[PDB]
């Protein structure tokens, strides 16, 4: 057929011309799928071989069934990503190859209970939660430091301020760092259509500060849209589990002290003011250590400031080279 070859050539030329266009946005998957094995891809053999929880950068538009995008991997080329509706269709295709999907079982009972698939056998039901396969995460993952104690106490503030200064100095002219005074742990997406749309309603949420949290959410989203690296200095993070189910999914950076004895003698080195809160500092430290390593993205366990600095610098250099 000439039409399929013509559309193949048109898509290839469009990709070649749009390889050097500004990036539009980014998304993150949560399902295991490959973009090359599908027959509906407009270009065969040049699909995306992604897995669960991967990041894609989209630049231009194709149709309601596919988009054009690249991976955040180093050297990743341009491929086609199935659309939200297309992914829903392929997911329905995933749960149709089985013998049955609805209520009528096939346990040696054929010919009596036909039971045509009701609304319970389609995607119409199961809307109690309805977790979307695709989520619009920020284009650049925010960098956040956690540990080794509560934010707002001398040891943690200095052990994070030194790293913040190193990041600012090493990446000067290519990084923006801002302190997020407002709360961030409530970065929800599916609470309601608009909780507190107006501040003059004088409601429970209208008079609250939740709208500030959401506004900071779009502020972070638009700053990540700028493609420059972002580092957060919000003093309301003490465990990645508090910001793991949200849409941001920030790069969790852990600075850990090797032993509780070292941490508490460090705390003793400050004075009586921190001796007063030493108890809660130790409690938060042990709770955060009990968090498993796979929860975090990078670890900083070296006792030398420098070694940790070049460790973080190398990781962010890899990220920068990967997304360009």
């Amino acid at each position: 057929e000439s039409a399929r070859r013509e559309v193949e050539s048109q898509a290839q030329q469009q990709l070649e011309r749009a390889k050097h266009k500004p990036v539009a946005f980014a998304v993150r998957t949560n399902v295991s799928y490959c973009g090359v094995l599908d027959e509906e891809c407009p270009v065969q053999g040049s699909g995306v071989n992604f897995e669960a929880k991967d990041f894609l950068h989209i630049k231009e538009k194709y149709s309601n069934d596919w988009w054009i995008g690249r991976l955040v991997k180093e050297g990743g080329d341009i491929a086609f990503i199935p659309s939200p509706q297309r992914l829903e269709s392929i997911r329905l295709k995933q749960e149709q190859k089985a013998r049955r999907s609805g209520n009528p079982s096939s346990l040696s009972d054929i010919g009596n209970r036909r039971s045509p698939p009701p609304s319970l056998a389609k995607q119409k039901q199961k809307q109690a939660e309805h977790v979307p396969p695709y989520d619009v995460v920020p284009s650049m993952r925010p960098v956040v430091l956690v540990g080794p104690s509560l934010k707002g106490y001398e040891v943690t503030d200095m052990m994070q301020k030194a790293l913040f200064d190193f990041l600012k100095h090493r990446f000067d002219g290519r990084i923006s760092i801002t302190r997020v005074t407002a709360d961030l742990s409530l970065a929800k997406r599916s609470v309601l259509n608009n909780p507190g749309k107006r501040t003059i309603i004088e409601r429970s949420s209208a008079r609250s500060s939740i709208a500030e949290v959401q506004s900071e959410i779009e502020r972070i989203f638009e700053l990540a849209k700028s493609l420059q690296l972002v580092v957060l200095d919000a003093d309301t993070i003490n465990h990645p589990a508090q910001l793991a189910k949200t849409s941001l999914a920030p790069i969790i950076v852990f600075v850990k002290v090797s032993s509780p004895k070292v941490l508490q003698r460090l705390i003793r080195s400050r004075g009586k003011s921190q001796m007063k809160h030493l108890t809660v500092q130790m409690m938060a430290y042990d709770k955060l250590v009990q968090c498993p390593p796979e929860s975090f993205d990078v670890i900083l366990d070296e006792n030398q400031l420098e070694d940790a600095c070049e460790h973080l610098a190398e990781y962010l250099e890899v990220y920068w080279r990967a997304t360009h």
């Binding site: 001398e154 040891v155 503030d157 200095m158 052990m159 994070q160 301020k161 030194a162 790293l163 913040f164 200064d165 002290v257 090797s258 032993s259 070292v262 003698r265 460090l266 080195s269 006792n303 030398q304 400031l305």
Partner: peptide, 14 residues
């Protein structure tokens, strides 16, 4: 470890 975790933590916010 204490030597590296005492000077470095007391120079930033400090």
């Amino acid at each position: 470890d204490l030597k590296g975790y005492l000077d470095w933590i007391t120079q930033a916010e400090d």
